Design a binder for this molecule. Structure first.
Ligand SMILES: CC(=O)N[C@H]1[C@@H](O[C@@H](CC(=O)O)C(=O)O)O[C@H](CO)[C@@H](O)[C@@H]1O
Ligand SMILES: CC(=O)N[C@H]1[C@@H](O[C@@H](CC(=O)O)C(=O)O)O[C@H](CO)[C@@H](O)[C@@H]1O
Ligand SMILES: O=c1ccn([C@@H]2O[C@H](COP(=O)(O)O)[C@@H](O)[C@H]2O)c(=O)[nH]1
Lengths: 361, 361
């Protein structure tokens, strides 16, 4: 049964944005009518974009994006007769969905997906606890991208609400290596992140120093963010400028995972770690920290390795085990691919979102 | 029975900011407990609570509406507020509504319209339903004039009673000396925010005719976007030496005290708080025949009213006042008795108190 589904999110912060957009693309492919309600964007015929323009109107001291977004949700809900609004993030989107629902004369189902950013915000301003709780409680169905995010939510927010785990999902290496001046005999390590402190790039670099000081190696650092200059400085301090490619942000990140032999994600906080799936899909074995959602993706000594937060020497050892032992590497990669094709497959995950919409319609 | 009353507003935009803070000052004196909740000597029963809006790398816009709602809820619960009194439908009534859906308690929401919601709506017609929802989700709604009540009903159509409750309110040789005004100059004053709706260009033209018929100074008091337009027009008519651009001011009372005539020739004006100030200081007023201005000025009794844009009639009215001391003192006397009756703080504060009393129990 074809539904009309509104989706309200920030179209791209890194991981979440990609997930919401991708999810909309896959529902479109299944014949559903999808209506993104977002800030202006720069596609399938069943996907439509509605833009929220915020103005100050010379009355408002701060631009009222929340209220403007609520308004626009309600307007679209009504004109297009939406069955669902799917909000990504409790704040602001789930509260806006709620406001839009109270404006509408019609009932409409609200689904909210927590990606982790409500926990982050709560760390900056714990007084938002009640508002986040309300937003969760006022949704019809609430999902989280990991069981560990869900548990953390229950712990800090304590809502009277079942939070269901629905995981994230994902959609010529000689030439690419050549483009990037990587030689046939260099081992390629990759790290993709938004360079925030919680990512601990400094740990990624200390591990890579250890690596490149044993075998011959190149590090691909992909992304941009606040701790970039901390990264460079540390690259220069250790003398690794020839051996590291600061690629900034990238498109064609699949090209970069395709040429890599090892993926490091050594975060102190991580609700899921979408970058792990992408590397797994490209047959790149992973080491991650044993926090947050990471151990729901990497199964230790089965699909990759897990290490303690900050444990550089343990991650080095794991890293070499993998870089030398082609047999270990291949068994990891193959175990990872099996996860992709079952638990993390877009077909299974899009159907779990879809079952929620049908429940509510 | 003393009550605990939260007040959410922008604490000194201009008129509304003055009203909301004086109202709280006056309720404090009668022994109510007043909690201002805003983005920021005083009576001991007045308390201030500040909201801090931050993005935290998560939000694209700082969510002031959501943070404000969250702070109202928090103060409401901690202090057992009986009442939240919001000034402006947007954002404050909606923030108060949100705070009230968050509270385990019931709380009375009082919303006062000042006319900004009409301004917002002219700029963005799609916010109609939101403004309507904000009005209908308040428990009681007031408006600063019957003209605003009526225009609100005609433009927004809320199913909600809007009650009219009005706004409420020496060594001149030294002052005139200080501003270089000589003893034989007539002084005309205009106090506004220099928005386009104030028609400062009509005030200046009228002044221009006056100044060609008698020795005159014009005090233009305040700041805003059309200030530079005003300046230019002054230059064009050659009046630089006859006009004082005082910019924003405190002790506006000093300036009224040296003035013989006040012009308010707006094309939109819900109430016109500046008329009451000028009346209290013994200055006769000419206003346009719109919005609330006629609820304040009685034509030929306590000032004159003219049509919007009618420079000829304003000039002729201005000359009749500046030439006839008898007329002027009759206007000024009559104006002052209106102030003691219709626009007294004792009367208006008690009207607000009665609303609060109806809502608490
Ligand atoms: C810090 C954190 O929890 N980040 C999660 C979070 O990342 C955020 C961005 C961020 O907060 O760094 C996002 O992409 O919206 O959600 C991702 C997608 O669901 C997860 O894969 C990330 O692990
Ligand atoms: C243009 C307009 O309607 N202004 C009203 C409005 O003024 C606004 C400022 C403005 O938008 O001009 C305010 O001060 O909040 O509210 C005042 C207080 O009730 C009224 O005296 C003004 O007449
Ligand atoms: O330069 C970059 C940095 C990050 N990403 C993408 O941002 C997302 C980060 O998700 P997560 O690891 O925060 O969950 C991934 O899809 C990743 O490929 C890029 O496309 N280019």
């Amino acid at each position: 049964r074809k539904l009309k589904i509104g989706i309200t999110c920030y179209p791209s912060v890194g991981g979440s944005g990609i997930i919401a957009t991708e999810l909309g693309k896959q529902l479109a492919e299944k014949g559903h009518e999808i209506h993104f309600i977002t800030s202006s964007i720069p596609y399938h015929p069943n996907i439509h974009f509605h833009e929220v323009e915020v103005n100050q109107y010379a009355v408002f001291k701060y631009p009222p994006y929340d209220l403007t977004l609520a308004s626009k949700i309600a307007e679209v809900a009504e004109r297009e007769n939406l069955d669902i609004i799917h909000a990504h993030y409790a704040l602001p989107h789930a509260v806006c969905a709620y406001l839009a629902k109270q404006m509408l004369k019609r009932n409409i189902g609200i689904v909210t997906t927590l990606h982790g950013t409500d926990i982050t915000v709560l760390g900056y301003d714990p007084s938002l606890k009640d508002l986040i709780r309300f937003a969760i409680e006022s949704s019809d169905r609430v999902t989280a991208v990991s069981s560990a995010l869900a548990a953390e939510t229950y712990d800090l927010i304590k809502p009277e609400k079942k939070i269901e785990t629905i995981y994230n999902f994902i959609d010529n290496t000689a030439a690419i290596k050549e483009k990037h001046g990587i030689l046939p005999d260099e081992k390629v390590v990759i790290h993709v992140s938004n360079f925030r402190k919680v990512k601990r790039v400094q740990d990624v670099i200390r591990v890579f120093r250890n690596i490149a000081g044993k075998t011959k190696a190149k590090l691909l650092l992909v992304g941009d963010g606040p701790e970039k200059s901390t990264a460079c400085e540390l690259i220069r301090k250790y003398g690794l400028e020839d051996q590291v490619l600061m690629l900034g942000n990238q498109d064609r990140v699949e090209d970069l995972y395709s040429i890599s032999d090892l993926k490091l994600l050594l975060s102190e906080k991580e609700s899921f770690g979408l970058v792990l799936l992408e590397a797994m899909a490209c047959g790149v074995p992973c080491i991650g920290t044993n926090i947050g959602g990471i151990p729901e993706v990497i199964k230790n000594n089965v699909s990759g390795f897990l290490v303690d937060v900050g444990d550089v020497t343990a991650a080095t050892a794991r890293a070499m085990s993998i870089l030398e032992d082609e047999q270990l590497s291949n068994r990891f990669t193959k175990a990872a691919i099996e996860m992709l094709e079952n638990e993390f497959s877009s077909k299974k995950i899009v159907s779990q979102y879809e079952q929620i919409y049908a429940d509510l319609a």
